[PDB]
Amino acid sequence: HGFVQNIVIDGKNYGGYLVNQYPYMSNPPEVIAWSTTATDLGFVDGTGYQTPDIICHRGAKPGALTAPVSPGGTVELQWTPWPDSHHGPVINYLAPCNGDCSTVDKTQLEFFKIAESGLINDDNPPGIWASDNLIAANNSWTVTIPTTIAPGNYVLRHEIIALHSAQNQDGAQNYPQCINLQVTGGGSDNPAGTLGTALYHDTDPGILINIYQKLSSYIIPGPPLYT
């Protein structure tokens, strides 16, 4: 349980959507982060993989702002303190907005995977995962925007999937957090995208999994990594 509370883009701070506070106030600030209704600080499980909740979290609506990012610039997502028990991959996707990200219809967004990190070491199950790397790095993750993609407005969908209860169907816990970016650079690729409701199936081998054993491999879920 947790959420992204701050985003640092090329060293500049952007406040996150404070789901622990803004849902309860009359005039919350405009931010680059999507609003959500995930006020339990919780997740979307497999029962929601084919519902709009999986796209940018439950009840999500586009942030009102969009942040410029330099070519191949860095986006650091700073989470609230992430529990060590919530072992699993950290995955990052972009979807072109083809216009103002604040007005997008999220069910139309076609995401391509830009980064993925999974099981790092399993000599002592449940092992060391991307989520443990995130914890060690001040509860944060840094995404580099590809230099090869066409510039314009994009939604970054940043996600931890916690696998501590994933041994049973719909047990995996997805924690997606979305922000709006204005991407720059000399790239021209428009990578093949996947609707948010088509990213995951509750039978995927990295989703329905018992991590309390020595795994020789881990198939990070979702569509293929774009390079």
Ligand X SMILES: *[C@@H]1O[C@H](CO)[C@@H](O[C@@H]2O[C@H](CO)[C@@H](O)[C@H](O)[C@H]2NC(C)=O)[C@H](O)[C@H]1NC(C)=O
- Residues in the annotated binding site: 1, 86, 164, 173, 175
Residue 5 sits in the site that holds ligand X (CB under 6 A): yes
Distances (CA, A) of 106 to 24, 50, 188: 23, 13, 23
Binding test (CB under 6 A) with ligand X, winner from 10, 12, 13, 224: 13
Choose the contact partner of 5 out of ligand X, Cu ion, Na ion, none; CB within 5 to 8 A by kind.
ligand X
The reply to whether 165 sits near Cu ion by the rule CB under 5 A is no
| Per CB under 6 A, 6 contacts ligand X | yes
Q: Segment contacting Cu ion (CB under 5 A): 1-9, 53-61, 130-138, 218-226? A: 1-9
CA-nearest of 170, 195, 3, 19 to 93 is 195
CA angle 179, 40, 131 (to 5 degrees): 60
Query: Do 213 and 174 contact (CB within 8 A), yes or no?
Result: no
d(CA 76, CA 11): 9
177 binds ligand X (CB under 6 A): no
Backbone angles phi, psi at 121, to 5 degrees: -155, 140
* 39 contacts Cu ion (rule: CB under 5 A): no
By the rule CB under 5 A, 1 interacts with Cu ion: yes
Cα–Cα distance for residue pair 53/133, rounded to 1 Å:
26
Nearer to ligand X, 77 or 162 (CB): 77
Binding residues for Cu(2+): 1, 86, 175
- Distance CA(33)–CA(46), nearest Å, equals 24
Q: Which residues bind ligand X (CB under 6 A)?
A: 5-6, 13, 78, 138-139
Q: Which residues bind Cu ion (CB under 5 A)?
A: 1
